[PDB]
Design an enzyme around this catalytic site. Structure first.
Site, short mmCIF file in Angstrom:
data_model
loop_
_atom_site.label_atom_id
_atom_site.label_comp_id
_atom_site.label_asym_id
_atom_site.label_seq_id
_atom_site.Cartn_x
_atom_site.Cartn_y
_atom_site.Cartn_z
N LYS C 10 0.83 -1.20 0.00
CA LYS C 10 0.00 0.00 0.00
C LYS C 10 0.87 1.25 0.00
O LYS C 10 1.78 1.38 0.81
CB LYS C 10 -0.97 -0.01 1.20
CG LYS C 10 -2.04 1.06 1.10
CD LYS C 10 -3.02 0.71 -0.01
CE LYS C 10 -4.36 0.29 0.50
NZ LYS C 10 -5.09 -0.55 -0.49
N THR C 57 -3.69 -5.43 0.69
CA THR C 57 -3.10 -4.07 0.76
C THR C 57 -3.94 -3.23 1.71
O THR C 57 -3.37 -2.59 2.59
CB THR C 57 -2.92 -3.41 -0.63
OG1 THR C 57 -4.17 -3.27 -1.32
CG2 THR C 57 -1.96 -4.28 -1.47
N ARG C 176 28.32 34.20 -10.58
CA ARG C 176 27.02 33.76 -11.08
C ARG C 176 26.14 33.46 -9.90
O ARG C 176 26.61 33.36 -8.75
CB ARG C 176 27.16 32.49 -11.90
CG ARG C 176 27.54 31.27 -11.05
CD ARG C 176 27.72 30.05 -11.91
NE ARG C 176 27.86 28.83 -11.11
CZ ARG C 176 27.91 27.59 -11.63
NH1 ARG C 176 27.85 27.43 -12.95
NH2 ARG C 176 28.00 26.53 -10.82
N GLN C 228 29.59 20.42 -8.02
CA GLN C 228 30.36 19.24 -7.61
C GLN C 228 31.19 19.46 -6.31
O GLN C 228 31.13 18.70 -5.31
CB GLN C 228 31.26 18.80 -8.76
CG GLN C 228 30.58 18.12 -9.94
CD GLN C 228 30.04 19.08 -11.00
OE1 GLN C 228 29.67 20.21 -10.69
NE2 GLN C 228 29.96 18.61 -12.25
N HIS C 256 19.30 27.16 -13.43
CA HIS C 256 20.02 28.23 -14.09
C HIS C 256 19.18 29.48 -14.11
O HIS C 256 18.00 29.40 -14.42
CB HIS C 256 20.38 27.89 -15.55
CG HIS C 256 21.03 26.57 -15.71
ND1 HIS C 256 22.31 26.30 -15.30
CD2 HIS C 256 20.55 25.40 -16.21
CE1 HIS C 256 22.61 25.04 -15.56
NE2 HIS C 256 21.56 24.48 -16.13
O1 AZA Z 1 -5.77 -7.11 -6.75
C1 AZA Z 1 -5.55 -6.90 -5.55
N1 AZA Z 1 -4.40 -7.34 -5.03
C2 AZA Z 1 -4.12 -7.18 -3.72
O2 AZA Z 1 -3.08 -7.58 -3.22
C3 AZA Z 1 -5.08 -6.48 -2.82
N2 AZA Z 1 -5.09 -6.15 -1.51
N3 AZA Z 1 -6.29 -5.53 -1.24
N4 AZA Z 1 -6.96 -5.46 -2.49
C4 AZA Z 1 -6.30 -6.04 -3.47
N5 AZA Z 1 -6.48 -6.27 -4.79
O1 AZA Z 2 28.49 23.79 -11.25
C1 AZA Z 2 28.43 23.42 -12.43
N1 AZA Z 2 28.82 22.18 -12.72
C2 AZA Z 2 28.81 21.73 -13.99
O2 AZA Z 2 29.18 20.59 -14.29
C3 AZA Z 2 28.33 22.59 -15.10
N2 AZA Z 2 28.18 22.43 -16.44
N3 AZA Z 2 27.71 23.62 -16.95
N4 AZA Z 2 27.54 24.47 -15.82
C4 AZA Z 2 27.92 23.92 -14.69
N5 AZA Z 2 27.99 24.27 -13.39
#
Ligand code: AZA
Ligand code: AZA
Ligand code: AZA
Ligand code: AZA
Ligand code: AZA
Ligand code: AZA
Ligand code: AZA
Ligand code: AZA
Ligand code: NA
Ligand code: NA
Ligand code: NA
Ligand code: NA
Lengths: 295, 295, 295, 295
Positions: C10, C57, C176, C228, C256
């Site tokens: 779920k 689920t 920049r 980096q 950018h």
């Molecule tokens: O198709 C389903 N699979 C499941 O495992 C499930 N669990 N609740 N409802 C469900 N429906």
């Molecule tokens: O910080 C940056 N790393 C990069 O690899 C890069 N490539 N273009 N501009 C950039 N600026």
């Protein structure tokens, strides 16, 4: 101080409905998200802590599900009218209901060239929406719309002849990409009430289909002078094909694809008539809007 | 301390390419987003401030656009192989290139039942992806995939017979909605290099189409015992239909639609066999994963 | 074909817990989103439709809420260990539990310079996460992390001395903007089990705070030669300040901000040393990654 | 058909500005996203393909950057007034400018309890916005706002006394969680023009701070009868503390946290006064709106 305007209700109510035809075995699904906001004599809930005037938002949620249980959910223009009428008729102090619906696509699957009876696919994030305002003593206003229709044409768009001055650097072009997300809204003539809305039911799905059709056809075929010019043409045709519409409104982003000049690398030719590789721009974007109605 | 692993490069590079067939007048567009990360002898850029080892991320961006200018961008499995090979061959200190591509749908428009020559629509947010790892002295590993294929079937899914204990409240069912977003990945046998990748080019588009086809067909037709059982069947068929795949991997959310009991209101019947109106749940969601390979 | 790997459970389980100190009147809230996936002898659910092997689920969801009811939810490294141990101890056929937790910020409000006893604010979309893998006969592996720490420094970043060739157009700079979203992950020495995890509890919150502190201090003070170089320094210090960490991993976008040359308009000076107005770029972005461990 | 309304321009223009105080060494950054749409005599661009009436959206983009180069960008109410006035004064056929600005937080970092001179953090996705409508012959209308202020109080909220009928299932409560995303907008008295806007400059930042302060103080301290009642109180105080505001508007989601009844498991007590563990609900949500002005 004083309350000049107030509305409240429930938003983002996800709703699924299935229709099972027992004769044919075939199932049809409808999914939507609903918002209902109410107005009326509710000011005292804000000013005096008087909750006796509140139809709980939780209860509005319960009502949406019931109403979808008891009535069709399609076309959305009808479901919304039914839902909004319900609140103003049921409650004496509530005088307007505002209903917004977004319809999500669940399209039937083709499996070896044959419509499968109960399997579906989301073939596009395109939505069909409605805005329904049901106002006591004022009838029912509907704005229908499509949104999120994303399109692109690789040529037959131009933009030349525009004002130039000391703020201008854009070059005129006779050949560019045009791409947009289409938002088209068509506003119906005010309906007297639910009976009248029922009377026009077949027009709703039909006019939606038309707006969609006109939009894609005109986008594809127009040798566009501008986004402005191309949208006007769409709007014109929707009005001309359905009398009950008073206005058609388009809102179109211009989603720019920029040329990439690669000549700095080995004299590589990728501009003008040699343009193959483009950089789609996420922002900014031109935004173009037009409301067209009847002369 | 010491650098145990390092990679760097450029992500979210949006790329559009147009192909104009001058004889037929017809234009074909390709859009994608590219990520290229490099490894090799680059530790000194981290530890000593030695930038002499950096192929600038900006330059990697420039290279993607050039490479798309000079070669096909389709199938993505090829474009990625070309792009990754480029970096390891061009630069002696760079020993691996990792290329990720997401392909966006631009489907040709039907305008009065005829393919328009230069107009396109995003008919689904479904993606086709690749992951290409080009490693010096180790060949080319490709994982292809589709993702964001959103489907729903309104019946012919069951979930009964599961463990029950003091944590269990879920009721067994012989009839429920099943809906999911399909993420399917198929991993190719290691290729010796670009020549080998070129040799299998026609398999790439074909196997993609197959995985998609198998997925939707099996989702639609299987009377699903569980999401587990239904995904196994898909994976099985993809392996059986293409020898060059070593593993197929599915990752499937179970997007729950809950019954809404409306009996508290006027004895309204909306559960079990009377279930028409459901509440789609946004969260939580079951998540089911399976990697299948060859006996 | 055969199942080579399977996990299920779920995801997206939203969980809120309140602690009410009755003596002091003060309330403390904890919010998180939990994912639990299980492995073990479950292949038959995929291959034979045998659901007897499925801890539903839904039931896993119920278990998360119970476990948060019965134990502390903080630190997340403990809650996750408790939750994962539960599944492998409770069920004989389940042999690993994978627990992922994202902690959402609810910071106490200052109201006239005094900590309010029960009111809170989301002061940042920054998250604290854990990844807990509880594997039968193999102990408990924890990766802690912070993510979505968005920072920017307007000067004291440089990027000069990098490889130049026929793909290079980027100009060297001694001044920049540097801006990033910090993703820092620190991996703990394998713990023998829950007793051991309990024994180190005070180290968890403390080491988180340290990683955060070191990150912001070094980002602010380093006259950065490269992303980096600056990340290496952060990673180095986290290892040096906590013996139980085996590796520290940074993943940093370079977001950018481009100079806008406005000289084409009235000789306006906005580049180099006159740079006041910049265009933040949404994409593409450099992506820089480094895993540092112990000599 | 005919154009009833039209506007166009540029949206999503990301803008960064740095201010370097050379005496003190300290740098201050401002980041925002701008939308400018224009109206005037532009109908012929839609109806006749006459682009001579178009101030290109590209040129509007260029103008935003220039204007931010030449004037302060803070307070946003001023920058927007300057920007909108520019277009209506510069171009005879353009008669209204609509400027929308979202200000992003870049808060100065504390590094060993001392304001760092050029390093910043996004401490919240909360925004400060303006909406500026500069209309030829009609002055300058400003709506200022804050949005995305996410708060939660774990007790001192109640909701009892609300209408009950056959649609109602919600139980009255004297103790619940209240959580919301605060959207507060305050509309200024119409200003005669830019001179007048300049004259009130100090009121803008001050009134923003006040609205924020009042909001959090009242949210924290009010023993809330309803979201309605609590928002009215906020709105009241903002009007009472600044004469130049005509209306204050709040829009508040009620982000529900549901009790989880765990008694089905070993009689576990987690409801009413034993409620510790709750399920935050992603949807649906109550939506509450109120416009307050002066008696
Ligand atoms: O198709 C389903 N699979 C499941 O495992 C499930 N669990 N609740 N409802 C469900 N429906
Ligand atoms: O910080 C940056 N790393 C990069 O690899 C890069 N490539 N273009 N501009 C950039 N600026
Ligand atoms: O504060 C609230 N106001 C409301 O109108 C409402 N409706 N259900 N819950 C609610 N809470
Ligand atoms: O390719 C481009 N086209 C444009 O119209 C434009 N405007 N600014 N930069 C640009 N690049
Ligand atoms: O309709 C529901 N089905 C379920 O399986 C479930 N589990 N918790 N609540 C639920 N509601
Ligand atoms: O201002 C810019 N800086 C850069 O590094 C760069 N690279 N491509 N375009 C650019 N513009
Ligand atoms: O179609 C367009 N309309 C416009 O107003 C515009 N402005 N720049 N580019 C443009 N394209
Ligand atoms: O805990 C809950 N509180 C509510 O108000 C509600 N309304 N529907 N379900 C609910 N669950
Ligand atoms: Na009424
Ligand atoms: Na190499
Ligand atoms: Na076990
Ligand atoms: Na004017």
């Amino acid at each position: 101080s004083a309350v000049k305007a107030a509305r409240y209700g429930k938003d983002n109510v996800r709703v699924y409905k299935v229709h099972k035809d027992e004769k044919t075995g075939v199932q049809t699904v409808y999914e939507m998200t609903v918002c209902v906001l109410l107005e009326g004599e509710i000011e005292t809930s804000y000013t005096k802590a008087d909750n006796s005037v509140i139809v709980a938002t939780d209860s509005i949620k319960n009502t949406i599900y019931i109403t979808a249980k008891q009535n069709p959910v399609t076309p959305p223009e009808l479901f919304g009218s039914i839902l909004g009428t319900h609140f103003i008729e049921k409650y004496n102090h509530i005088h307007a209901a505002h209903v917004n619906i977004v319809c999500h696509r669940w399209t039937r699957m083709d499996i070896d060239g044959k419509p499968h009876p109960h399997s579906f696919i989301r073939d596009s994030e395109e939505k069909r929406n409605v805005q329904v305002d049901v106002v006591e003593g004022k009838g029912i206003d509907i704005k229908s719309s499509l949104s999120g229709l994303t399109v692109l044409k690789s040529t037959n768009s131009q933009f030349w002849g525009f004002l130039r001055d000391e703020y201008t650097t854009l070059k005129e072009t006779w050949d560019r990409i045009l791409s947009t997300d289409v938002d088209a809204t068509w506003q119906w003539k005010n309906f007297s009430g639910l009976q009248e809305v029922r009377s026009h039911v077949p027009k709703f799905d039909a006019t939606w289909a038309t707006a969609r059709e006109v939009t894609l056809k005109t986008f594809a075929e127009d040798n566009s002078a501008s986004v402005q010019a191309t949208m006007y043409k769409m709007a014109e045709q929707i009005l001309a094909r359905q009398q009950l519409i008073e206005t058609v409104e388009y809102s179109l982003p211009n989603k720019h694809y920029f040329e990439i000049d690669l000549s700095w690398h080995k004299g590589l030719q990728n501009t003008g008539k040699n343009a193959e590789v483009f950089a789609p721009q996420s922002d900014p974007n031109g935004l173009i809007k037009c409301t067209v109605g009847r002369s």
